Amino acid sequence: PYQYPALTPEQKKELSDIAHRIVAPGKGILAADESTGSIAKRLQSIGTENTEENRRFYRQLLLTADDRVNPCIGGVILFHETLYQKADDGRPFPQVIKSKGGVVGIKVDKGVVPLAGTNGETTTQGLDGLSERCAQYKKDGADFAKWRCVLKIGEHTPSALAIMENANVLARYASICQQNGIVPIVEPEILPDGDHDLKRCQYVTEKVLAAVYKALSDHHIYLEGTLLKPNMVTPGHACTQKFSHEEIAMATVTALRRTVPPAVTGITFLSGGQSEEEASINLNAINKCPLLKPWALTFSYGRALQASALKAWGGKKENLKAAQEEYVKRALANSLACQGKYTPSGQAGAAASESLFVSNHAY
Amino acid sequence: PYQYPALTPEQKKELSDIAHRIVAPGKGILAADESTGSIAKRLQSIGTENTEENRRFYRQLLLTADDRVNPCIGGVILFHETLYQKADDGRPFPQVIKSKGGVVGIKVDKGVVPLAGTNGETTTQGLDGLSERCAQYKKDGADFAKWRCVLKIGEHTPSALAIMENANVLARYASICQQNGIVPIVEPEILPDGDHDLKRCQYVTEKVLAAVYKALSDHHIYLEGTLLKPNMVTPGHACTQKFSHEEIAMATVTALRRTVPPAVTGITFLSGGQSEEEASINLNAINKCPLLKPWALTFSYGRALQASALKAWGGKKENLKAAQEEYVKRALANSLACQGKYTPSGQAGAAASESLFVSNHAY
Amino acid sequence: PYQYPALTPEQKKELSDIAHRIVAPGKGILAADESTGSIAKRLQSIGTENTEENRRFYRQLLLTADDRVNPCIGGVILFHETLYQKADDGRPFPQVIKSKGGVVGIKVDKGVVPLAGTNGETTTQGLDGLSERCAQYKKDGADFAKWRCVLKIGEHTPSALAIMENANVLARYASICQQNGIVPIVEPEILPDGDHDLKRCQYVTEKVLAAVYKALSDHHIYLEGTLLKPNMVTPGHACTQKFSHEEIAMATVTALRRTVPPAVTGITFLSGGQSEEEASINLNAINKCPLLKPWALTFSYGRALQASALKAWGGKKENLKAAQEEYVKRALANSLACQGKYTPSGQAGAAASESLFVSNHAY
Amino acid sequence: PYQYPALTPEQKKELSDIAHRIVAPGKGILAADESTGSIAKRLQSIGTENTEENRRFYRQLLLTADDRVNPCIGGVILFHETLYQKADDGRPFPQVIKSKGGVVGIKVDKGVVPLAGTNGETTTQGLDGLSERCAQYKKDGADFAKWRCVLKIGEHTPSALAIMENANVLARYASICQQNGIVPIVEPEILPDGDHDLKRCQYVTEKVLAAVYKALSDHHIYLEGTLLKPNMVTPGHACTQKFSHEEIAMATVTALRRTVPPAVTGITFLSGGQSEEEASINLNAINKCPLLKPWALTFSYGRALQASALKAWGGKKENLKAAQEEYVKRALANSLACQGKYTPSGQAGAAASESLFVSNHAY
Ligand SMILES: O=C(COP(=O)(O)O)[C@H](O)[C@@H](O)[C@H](O)COP(=O)(O)O
Ligand SMILES: O=C(COP(=O)(O)O)[C@H](O)[C@@H](O)[C@H](O)COP(=O)(O)O
Ligand SMILES: O=C(COP(=O)(O)O)[C@H](O)[C@@H](O)[C@H](O)COP(=O)(O)O
Numbered sequence A, B, C, D: 001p002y003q004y005p006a007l008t009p010e011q012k013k014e015l016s017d018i019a020h021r022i023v024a025p026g027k028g029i030l031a032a033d034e035s036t037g038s039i040a041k042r043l044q045s046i047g048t049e050n051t052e053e054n055r056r057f058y059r060q061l062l063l064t065a066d067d068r069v070n071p072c073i074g075g076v077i078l079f080h081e082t083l084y085q086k087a088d089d090g091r092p093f094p095q096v097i098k099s100k101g102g103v104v105g106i107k108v109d110k111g112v113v114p115l116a117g118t119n120g121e122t123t124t125q126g127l128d129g130l131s132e133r134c135a136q137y138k139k140d141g142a143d144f145a146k147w148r149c150v151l152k153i154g155e156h157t158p159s160a161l162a163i164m165e166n167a168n169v170l171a172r173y174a175s176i177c178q179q180n181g182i183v184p185i186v187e188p189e190i191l192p193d194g195d196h197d198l199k200r201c202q203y204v205t206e207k208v209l210a211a212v213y214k215a216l217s218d219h220h221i222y223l224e225g226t227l228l229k230p231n232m233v234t235p236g237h238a239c240t241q242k243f244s245h246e247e248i249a250m251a252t253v254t255a256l257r258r259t260v261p262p263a264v265t266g267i268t269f270l271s272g273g274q275s276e277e278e279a280s281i282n283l284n285a286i287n288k289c290p291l292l293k294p295w296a297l298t299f300s301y302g303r304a305l306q307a308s309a310l311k312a313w314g315g316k317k318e319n320l321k322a323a324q325e326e327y328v329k330r331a332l333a334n335s336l337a338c339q340g341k342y343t344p345s346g347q348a349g350a351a352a353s354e355s356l357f358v359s360n361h362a363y
């Protein structure tokens, strides 16, 4: 075919650098970008009103935890609201995030919508006037974005059209971000729901990731400037077989070795239902797996870096410090886990081994 | 593959019926849906302010022309504004349109955006929350929608990604309309600009239409419930060869016979630069062409049903009647032309043989 | 894209003409091209040795039946052996076929082979040095060829790769024939085996035919120079619902209207298990169906034009005349059926209403 | 989608092991598989008759060179004839190859054929009854096969259909080999001919390799059991810019990092016109390039391991030893080069810096 280049050398360069910092050795991403209606479902759990101050406070208590979290967090995905919010020192949260060394993201996707002619499969919207929105968030201090897609394992799903749609709207989104100087995180999530086993999950991650990378290459996207955010390959939540963690690690790194090119900068994992310990152990075997892992293999965790601190805050302002202890413990844990240097053996659960799995309903 | 049906029998039925009425024998569509910034460029031509009343008036003078236009117009594409406007009798324009027998459309597309990594190729946006908008327009009296896509003939274009993107966003749009009870008009426009000849245009319409129909079939869309709106195959505006009208007709019906299935209800042509007579002669040879034409072969004309009436109004309210004479002459002409019963030979030009070709710039 | 034309005007012209004669009003194709191992299975039925003379004789008795079959048969698909055989008048069988007005085909496919990684799905081979073989058969008097492909309806089949492979090897084959002056018959057969209903069959014919036509268009193939040979849409042989013949006709012409372009010259049906009457009634409702059928809708029958004559010959040379009566009755019947002018009502079965359905095993 | 596994654990295992031995640290492949008509063109060069003994002898002198070549050659691609030939010790050449430690391949492709509707683009044949042939060669001691495909850089080529065809017939071939216990070498060769620069070549390797890997994944092929054999990215032979070797190395490893998954065992390079030194220097910078190279990066050289020994033999039996010195020097050189430990600086050319570039004509 023929080349009317997408990007300049200068732009290829900004892109790989923001990509490299995010997933530098030991770092991961905090996924703090629940919409208002998901954060609300979470605040109920500790019977607290879902209002703007509480949401500001809550975020304030995750971003301003002490400097032991600095070498641990390469970036934080924000929701559009929190992007324009201030800590009580009156400095806005993109300046708090930068100052403890991390890179500020924003989520730019507007949800999933049903694909007609499907057993429940969705695609996801957000492109209309995306570009405009990439240009403003970059002005405001966001350097990376995140778009989510959902696939499902069922008797007749993910359908071919489902794979193909979801792949192509990742790539559209990818391109429009790259043109605004923003690294797109790509999230093709295969849901955990169902009673599939470890091997079906593996099969499906493989056909999905394959579809994404071709799409990306069709769409011209500059892969060093991107990150993958995929499911780890696990049985399904209803599965009657039990599987070890080295198995899940194997399942996972093999599917990723069969599909993801060595130019991608790093793959940041989603928690997807695992609990705080279950995630961290899983992340850690992944980096202990003997196979050649040509990309960073790190965390991009939302519920998993938050359960415990949420149970511990309980909405009472007087518990700030106990909640940050909480989050910190988990950002310590994962920094260790992303390096294969995590050792639980001892080292305390509670709310950390409670399962954080919800209805994957739809919208 | 496997069937989780998109549509019910009841819904297949409403869809084919709105589709059949639009392009009933003798009828065509008036394309009155210029956005505000395109109508504005048009009102300048007759030095009149581009304001809301003038735009209301102007539309009022096309929709309320006499009943000699009734058997001629199966439907009218409106712009979102004119949908909520009233004639001076205080009845809104969807009720004026219905009452002279025609079916009300709306345009639902939000423009074209550049595809990066391309020699100028665009895709087009509008999906975000499309569905919501199909559901409201159907409530307000729209039964068909229109989405435009643009391809370009150049040395290295239409690129493969261009074909593939444009095809797939037609089909996404198609599906979401069908689910709200609305017939999607599909407009894959190959631009006329350039110096290609008649045969390149033909080649390109053929690879494009092929891509659209596969896409449609991937996306499950119920084809009897749709209409095509394509370019006729013509040389390029800069072309040094001259070509006859029977040639253009041949070029055109052959490409359409090689690609469009006999389940599509009818293809409504775009003017795309031809002048009022040039369009009508062209439409008319198309229906005189000896080849088996298994679908209605009619007009969906905007500038072509409007030049003359625009020159004639000149924004002076005192010329109402002369402008409607004007539009009427052209809706007569085309009703004849869509049936192959059009005879110019005599029968007066002016502004009718002036070329209505603009920069296809981009946005 | 860009045009380095496949074919010249001269070659487009020979191609559409051989295509037109085959399926001229009232005509159909006799499919006499069983390989040696399938004809052998047939000769067992009447306990006769499967040798070269018997096979010559047998073919001799189908091609030299009286002139009441002339206006009925536009062409005859031969097997490579029978191509070089002589009637006992010492004129070879391509000259016998021509002289009663029909066009001589050959089968050029070499069977199906398993696709690995499939629940039993095959593709089909024959391309190696195909061209060489098209060039010699055209020299010997073949003007059309036939290639068969097999899809299967099962819980997880036809798989996507199955559709895609089978489509693309039809198109490869198509192109190589067109370049030797030979019309390719295209046979994407969906098998009848299973317990699917009428609607699954319809769904599957539709996704399959869609895939074939895109493939054809990718491969540049000149569609007027081709013929389709597809399954009619029927429930599956194990199906517990009973369906009428007008239903099967509807199912069938709708799927064909949704997918096959009006440039294809004519679709010649396969019998696929139906019995002599069942085929003919089915063909005849197809041409009685009210829907607009923009292509000839005729027969390409092997077992269905042969059961009765096979039972009647019984390998005894003394029954020649009774067998030709037999075949003749069925070529009469179908000529009527392809025109919707067939009336059984009375008019004698026997072996004509016996089912001619076999294991669709594989090879 | 859904899994009816292609291969068993036992079969995955034989496949990765033959794949690993081929491209073990320091080893490469000798490509000794010229057909009779290409070897003949080569023997002319030294005015010797192209007969069966000479061809046996010639091959005898490459396979029985001393043990300094053992740690250097992981495998040797033979032509079908040489597979059944004996050294003068009366042991056949698969036993000579095994005994000096290497793995025996065979070429199974039958040439390229023109794709109609193309500016000269070909696909390649060989599938008919491939399987049968994989099964016999494995019985005779072949454990890997090789299939070649050709793409071309021109104004309008490689066309999309060209990419797509060539990709899919690699994958068909791939699958059929894996099912017979044979590792397929995959050769998507982009030709060097033309006046493209280094960057077009890179663009094209990237769109091509992308297409191959999707195809492979569609076709289910088990990637650890395969090897890539691609062009290095170089300007075109008519190119007026000069480019360094670190540039060519960069161009090359970046394209391979953007497309080839880390599960492929190793990529064996083709010489494609470079001369003995030019190849070896090029191979060696490739392994000196700082980028993370997650797969072996070695040689699969035919003319490049043979020029000098061919000039030196001159068909006189009395020069055996000088020719093997010759080949040996080059198998030393490359073993060094594949490890980035090659140092020319000094170390003698002649015929080693003569260019081995031919017309890429077609067949
Ligand atoms: O970044 C995430 C990670 O979660 P984990 O599975 O790693 O804990 C998610 O993938 C996002 O789904 C998101 O919070 C859901 O949409 P939202 O709730 O705002 O409307
Ligand atoms: O329905 C149409 C027909 O025009 P003709 O080529 O048949 O005269 C067009 O295809 C639309 O492009 C439209 O008026 C352009 O976008 P808008 O100007 O509102 O922002
Ligand atoms: O032209 C045909 C029609 O049969 P009907 O279903 O219309 O009776 C077939 O589709 C061919 O399968 C063929 O005789 C089978 O391969 P063969 O047996 O020689 O090795």
Ligand SMILES: O=C(COP(=O)(O)O)[C@H](O)[C@@H](O)[C@H](O)COP(=O)(O)O
Binding pocket: D031, D033, D034, D035, D036, D038, D039, D077, D148, D187, D269, D270, D271, D272, D273, D300, D301, D302, D303, D304, D305
């Ligand atoms: O394995 C090869 C390597 O050559 P180099 O470019 O690495 O020297 C080739 O890619 C093959 O083309 C082959 O010898 C050509 O077909 P053949 O001549 O037998 O009919």
